[PDB]
Amino acid sequence: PWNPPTFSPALLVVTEGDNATFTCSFSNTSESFVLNWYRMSPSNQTDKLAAFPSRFRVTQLPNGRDFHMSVVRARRNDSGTYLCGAISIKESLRAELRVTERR
Amino acid sequence: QVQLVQSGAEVKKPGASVKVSCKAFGYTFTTYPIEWMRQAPGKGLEWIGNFHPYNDDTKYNEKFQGRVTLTVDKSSTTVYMELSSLRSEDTAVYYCARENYGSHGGFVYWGQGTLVTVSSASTKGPSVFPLAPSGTAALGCLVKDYFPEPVTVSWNSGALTSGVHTFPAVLQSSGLYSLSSVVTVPSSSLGTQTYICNVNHKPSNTKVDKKVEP
Amino acid sequence: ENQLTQSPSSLSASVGDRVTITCRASSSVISSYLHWYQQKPGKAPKLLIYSTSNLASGVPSRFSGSGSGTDYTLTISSLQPEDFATYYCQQYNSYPLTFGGGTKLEIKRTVAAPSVFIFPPSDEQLKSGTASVVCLLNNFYPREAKVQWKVDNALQSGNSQESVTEQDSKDSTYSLSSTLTLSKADYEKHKVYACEVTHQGLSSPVTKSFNR
């Protein structure tokens, strides 16, 4: 897969109720792409959470290369595997979210 | 090829400060949080807190809320654990560690640990006293009032290893360590053969032999 | 915090035997977030099992983990010599992270009675103003022993410290020092120093004494 987006960091750990913000990095060579944030489910399925251009939000950053993929008010069951994907599907590598129990 | 490299051991007086380093090799420094732990001698593991170089977020255990600062230097891919106002109780091996993909909170890679000894005691060599013998005879050497750990004890410059027991040091209340080293030998050898204990405490440059005689 | 409690804290078994270690959590833990470590002396812990039951990379399959809720276990099916170590459980369900207190796995062996020896303080040491009296229990199994001091028939307390070796690499026995620390003055005020040892491998207690 040539020039896929990256997604950082590899692991984000927060307590339930907190926000978590990943960064999808993608410099298109092609013009007109869409950038999707996805969740991987048990048997390797994907589900789409948000997109460029709900608790899940994508924002392009001022450098244009970068995109915050934000979760607001994380729940426990938000824990899991996430990635980003560009369409000029070129998939980023996977990262993880873990949402801890607030005692 | 991931490895975490920690700074060397540190002996400290009460009230002082330590800054232990944890430098990361072999991955993108910002991808994973660095976790800090400690384990007092023969104890069990206690979590201190963590630093995520991604976003500079810290999580601390309430125990160490104030006294510990975690900081980073991304340039050198190092996280630092600074502990202020050191107590005797903070005597421990301090570990850094991180997760890997899908360990769900299991720590896959660990630093080598940094022993931090906090004591009012100051560095000094042991006094070495015979434990004189008097079938099978026992003899030995008492190795008393040194600091910090460790010492090493051999018998007859390594020639005698059968029957040798050198006991873990115990901390006396003086804050200095003490141990004996013993060996059993044929009582018929007593007086005929020679038995010398070799005691080395490198922190004080102490190199003492003692002849143990009847 | 969610305290983790492991049982037992020391366990004994033979090469080729099975063992089961227990980790009970004070509150319920999602099983994905409970993990096991092995620690050999001097070295860092190593991940063994993650998410309750998955072997870590390069871990042999004689190792397995199980459980849920508050009750987790670890099983080694076929003890190898390299497996005598300490084992720790850990939780990542909530902050603060907690670890269990440790289970140390030791080598089971037949019973062996100690030989007991008693060492008076050296003159060399008495000049200095202190007197250490060492009682040695040598090459015994299992580890539990009762060592008592009498000075002129008075039971002593507060004033002795015990140290025990790790199992001998050859014969798997322990040895134990008990050291009574007295001032030269206190030492010189009494005559008979006795160490009495009770141990399962003995017929009845063994006493070693000297007169100052």
User: Per the structure block, which two tokens stand in for C46?
Assistant: 């190593």
Cα gap A22→A37, rounded to integer Å: 10
Residues 6 or more apart whose Cβ sits within 8 Å of residue A9 = A22, A23, A95, B30, B31, B32, B52, B54
- Kindly determine whether residue A96 and residue B101, on different chains, have CB atoms separated by under 8 Å: yes
Distance of alpha carbon B83 from alpha carbon B89, whole angstroms: 12
Closest CA to C212 of C119, C127, C129: C119
Which of C2, C87, C93, C134 to mutate to test binding with chain B, by most B CBs within 10 Å of its CB? C134
Q: Could you tell me if C59 and C139 lie in one domain?
A: no
- Asked whether residue C92 falls in the same domain as residue C32, the answer is yes
List C-alpha distances in Å: B13 to B1, B19, C183. Answer: 37, 14, 28
Question: Phi, psi at residue C127, to the nearest 5°?
Answer: -50, -40
* Cβ atoms < 10 Å from Cβ of B58: 14
- Of C211, C168, C209, nearest to C190 by C-alpha is C211
Q: Are B30 and A8 in contact (CB < 8 Å)? A: yes
Tokens 């993929």 — which residue?
A69
Question: Taking Cα atoms as reference points, which of B41, B34, B89, B97 lies closest to residue B64?
Answer: B89
State how far the Cα of C79 lies from the Cα of C20, in Å rounded to an integer: 11
Interface of C with B in 160-199 (CB under 8 A): 161-165, 168, 175-177, 179, 181
Residue C206 to residue C195: CA distance in whole angstroms: 8
Query: B55: distance to nearest CA of chain A, Å?
Result: 9
- Which of these three, C107, C141, C165, is where a domain ends? C107
- Dist CA C43 CA B95 (whole Å): 11
Listed residue (B22, B35, B147, B15) closest to B90, CA to CA: B15
Domain boundary (C84, C107, C130) is at: C107
A11, A21, A94 ranked by CB distance to B33: nearest: A11
Residue C36 is part of a domain; what is its CATH number?
2.60.40.10
Q: Which H or E run includes C124?
A: helix C123-127
8 A C-beta contact, residue B36 and residue B70: yes
Architecture of domain B127-211: Sandwich (2.60)
Residue range(s) defining the domain that contains residue A76: 6-100
Resolution of the solved structure (Å): 2.0
Reported residue count of chain A is 103
Which residues fall within 8 angstroms of residue B74, CB to CB, at 6 or more apart? Answer: B29, B30, B53
Residues C179 and C128 occupy one common structural domain: yes
Q: How many CB atoms lie within 10 A of CB B56?
A: 12
- Beta bridge partners, B109, equal B98
Domain B3-118 has what CATH class?
mainly beta
- Measured between CA atoms, the residue of chain C closest to residue A13 is C92
> Between residues 16 and 55 of chain A, which touch chain B (CB distance below 8 Å)?
21
Chain B contact present for C2, CB below 8 A: no
Strand B18-25 relative to strand B3-6, pairing: antiparallel
Would you call A9 an interface residue with chain B, using a CB distance cutoff of 8 Å? yes
Collapse the DSSP code of C90 into the 3-class scheme (helix H, G, I; strand E, B; otherwise coil) and give the result.
strand
At residue B155, φ and ψ (nearest 5 deg) are -125, 130
Strands B57-60, B114-118: parallel, antiparallel or unpaired by DSSP?
Answer: unpaired
Which of B47, B144, B182 comes nearest C136 by C-beta?
B182
- Which domain covers residue C206, as residue numbers? 115-211
Query: C79 to chain B, minimum CA–CA distance in Å?
Result: 23
* Parallel/antiparallel/unpaired status of strands C192-198 and C146-151: antiparallel
- Which regions of chain B carry the CATH code 2.60.40.10? 3-118, 127-211
Q: Give chain C's domain count.
A: 2
Q: How far apart are CA B146 and CA C79, in angstroms?
A: 39
Could you write out the three-class secondary structure of chain A? CCCCCEEECCEEEEECCCCEEEEEECCCCCCCCEEEEEEECCCCCEEEEEEECCCEEEEECCCCCEEEEEECCCCHHHCEEEEEEEECCEECCCEEEEEEECC
Amino acid at C132: S
**Which residues, including other chains, have CB under 8 Å from residue C70's CB and lie 6 or more apart?**
C24, C25, C26, C27, C28, C29
Q: Can you tell me the distance from the alpha carbon of C132 to that of C177, in angstroms, rounded to the nearest whole number? A: 12
Q: Give the H/E segment covering residue C126.
A: helix C123-127
What are C10's two structure tokens?
A: 């020391």
What CATH number does the domain containing A68 carry?
A: 2.60.40.10
Number of H helices, E strands in chain C: 2, 18
Is C13 in the same domain as C46? yes
Neighbours of chain C (3+ CB pairs under 8 A): A, B
DSSP string, chain B: --EEEEPPPEEE-TT--EEEEEEEESS-GGGSPEEEEEE-TTS-EEEEEEEETTTTEEEE-GGGTTTEEEEEEGGGTEEEEEE-S--GGG-EEEEEEE--TT-TT---EE---EEEEE-S---BPPEEEEE----EEEEEEEEEEEBSS--EEEETTTTB-TT-EEPPPEE-TTS-EEEEEEEEEEGGGBTTB--EEEEEEGGGTEEEEEE---
Nearest residue to C176 via CA among C134, C133, C138: C138
B28 CB neighbours in chain A (<8 A) are 8, 10
C52 contacts C31 by C-beta, under 8 angstroms: yes
SS3 sequence, B70-111? EEEEHHHCEEEEEECCCCHHHCEEEEEEECCCCCCCCCCEEC
Same domain, C133 and C194: yes
Q: How far apart are CA C93 and CA C73, in angstroms?
A: 17
Clarify whether residues C92 and C178 are in a common domain: no
Specify whether C91 is located in the same domain as C120: no
SS3 C50: strand
| Same domain as C87, residue C142 | no
CA of B180: which chain C residue's CA is closest? C177
Give how far C101 is from chain A: nearest CA, Å.
21
Angle at B40 between CA B169 and CA C52, to 5 degrees: 125
- Total domains, chain A: 1
- In this structure, the answer to whether residues C148 and C205 fall within a common structural domain is yes
B167 contacts C163? CB cut-off 8 A? yes
Task: State whether C201 and C173 are in the same domain.
Answer: yes
In a domain, A1, yes or no: no
The reply to whether C96 and C122 lie within a common domain is no
Q: Which residues contact B156 (CB under 8 A, 6 or more apart)?
A: B194, B195, B196
Cβ of residue B147 closer than 8 Å to a chain A Cβ: no
Test A103 with C92 for CB contact under 8 angstroms: no
Contact B149/B117 with Cβ under 8 angstroms?
yes
CB contact under 8 A, B131 and C119: yes
Residue whose structure tokens are 């991180």: B98
Provide the Cα torsion C133, C138, C141, C145; round to 10°.
-10
| Ramachandran assignment for A80, one of left (phi > 0), alpha (psi -120 to 50 degrees), beta (any other) | left
Q: Give the chain C residue nearest B130 (alpha carbons).
A: C122
Q: Which of C52, C80, C107 is the last residue of a domain?
A: C107
| Angle (CA) C206 C208 C212, round 5° | 160
- What tokens appear for B99 in the block? 């997760």
The experimental method is: X-ray
Q: Is residue C139 within 8 Å of residue C173, measured between CB atoms?
A: yes
C115–B178 CB contact, under 8 Å? no
Helix H or strand E segment including C127 = helix C123-127
Nearest to C139 by CA among C99, C107, C119, C167: C167
Q: Are C96 and B60 in contact (CB under 8 A)?
A: no
Give the integer Cα–Cα distance in Å for C41 and C88: 13
